[PDB]
Design a binder for these strands. Structure first.
Length: 403
DNA sequence: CCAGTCCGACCCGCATCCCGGA
DNA sequence: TCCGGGATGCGT
DNA sequence: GTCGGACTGG
């Protein structure tokens, strides 16, 4: 039945309740996700029988609208679902029920991101440092970049320790860090937020992310705090936030699972790059540079702050193009994707980096499995990536720049 | 894209839960 | 019982 | 995390 989901039903189109957002300019924004069923280019009504029996040749379409107050309306392309999932079993879904099951998931995840949890700050600049970072009266601060899971810790009026993630999701386990945080908040400032990283030295990102998301309390990770902020003084410049953070750890520097990262003041770009090369040789991901006057700009709407810089080695390699495919939903349906192979014959999907969507559309509509095997099979695709997968050798965070 | 800001779609890896086929 | 694949929801 | 598109006037 439709009334079991939040939202109204009008003109054969179900519209979830609009989720209110807050833009950077202080203007209200709205986001609505809708579901409609199309058969022979016609919007047919949604009946209860569609949740247990599939109407043949009928397609359910998921689309969304986003508009700022008094602004234009942005309507995404239709996410066409054409078949249910687990079609052979008891837990099988139909085309309509799977569409509402997927639309409600897009709704619940979207409601969590919008508005005492505050999204952590995010880095905008990659391997470049703006000259404005050194034109300030105070030197910028360079830190070690640990390849772990982002986490923010704060205290509630109840007294419990709240420890959430980058997407504002409360970590279930990690009890060993919650204990030290509870003991820590007995001495230090009551209403301060501790922004840091979940990490264990010499451990891969895949192992760190797994233990951070597991309900099992293995209690292995450490909390490396690199920043702090108060909710009422988000405009506090970075250098003052670093000084106050150091005074916090001068109280109790003997915590087992909570540590403060080391700050390095630099005068020019090489002093940063020399420490970057030093940190890489120590086994770290790279280096983070912080503007001295930069305030704490929370990651609302996945915003990236221009007062931070990330210095990381960008690795490249050549891979053997073997097959091709396409995206599944929305604007990616009909857009070509590359498939490369490894010495062990395992495959992976790569996205072309320097193509318009018209090129990827036209490439997929003009290619056949016979035309591909005649012209492009076996070619070399240079691929940028952050790291190689330590278990399967797959280039991770990979994108194809060309041939 | 004039940048800026924001959305939307995707890669792999892992945790978990649901299911059969053994 | 036992083990895999599917599906989902996290993370970089 | 990646990147393209597209609205915004930061």
């Amino acid at each position: 039945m439709l009334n079991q989901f939040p939202g109204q039903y009008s003109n054969n189109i179900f519209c979830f309740p609009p989720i209110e957002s807050e833009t950077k300019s202080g203007k209200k924004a709205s986001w609505i996700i809708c579901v409609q069923v199309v058969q022979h280019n016609t919007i047919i009504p949604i009946t209860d029988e569609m949740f247990s029996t599939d109407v043949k040749d009928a397609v359910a379409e998921i689309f969304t609208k986003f508009f700022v107050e008094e602004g234009a309306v942005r309507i995404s392309k239709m996410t066409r679902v054409t078949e249910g999932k687990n079609l052979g079993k008891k837990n099988a879904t139909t085309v309509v029920h799977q569409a509402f099951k997927d639309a409600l998931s897009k709704y619940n995840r979207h409601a969590r991101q919008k508005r005492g949890m505050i999204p952590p700050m995010l880095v905008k600049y990659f391997n470049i440092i703006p000259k404005t970072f050194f034109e300030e009266e105070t030197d910028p601060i360079v830190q070690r970049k640990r390849n772990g899971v982002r986490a923010v810790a704060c205290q509630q009026g109840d007294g419990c320790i709240l420890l959430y993630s980058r997407t504002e999701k409360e970590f279930l386990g990690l009890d060993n860090i919650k204990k030290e945080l509870k003991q820590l908040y007995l001495f230090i400032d009551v209403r301060v937020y501790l922004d840091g990283e979940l990490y264990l030295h010499r451990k891969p990102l895949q192992w760190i992310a797994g233990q951070a998301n597991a309900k099992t309390d293995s209690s292995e990770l450490h909390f490396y705090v690199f920043d702090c902020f108060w909710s009422d003084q988000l405009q506090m410049p970075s250098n003052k936030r670093q000084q106050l953070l150091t005074n916090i750890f001068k109280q109790k520097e003997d915590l087992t699972f909570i540590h403060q990262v080391e700050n390095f003041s630099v005068k020019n770009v090489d002093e940063a790059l020399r420490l970057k090369a030093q940190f890489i040789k120590e086994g770290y991901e790279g280096a983070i540079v912080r503007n001295a006057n930069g305030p704490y700009e929370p990651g609302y709407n996945n915003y990236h702050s221009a007062h931070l810089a990330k210095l990381k080695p960008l690795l490249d390699a050549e891979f053997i193009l073997v097959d091709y495919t396409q995206g599944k939903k929305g604007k990616d349906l009909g857009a070509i994707l590359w498939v490369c192979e490894l010495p062990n014959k395992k495959r992976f999907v790569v996205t072309p980096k320097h193509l318009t969507y018209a090129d990827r559309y036209a490439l997929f509509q003009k290619l056949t499995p016979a035309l591909f095997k005649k012209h492009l099979y076996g070619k070399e695709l240079t691929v940028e990536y952050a790291e190689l997968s330590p278990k399967t050798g797959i280039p991770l965070q990979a994108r194809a720049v060309g041939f």
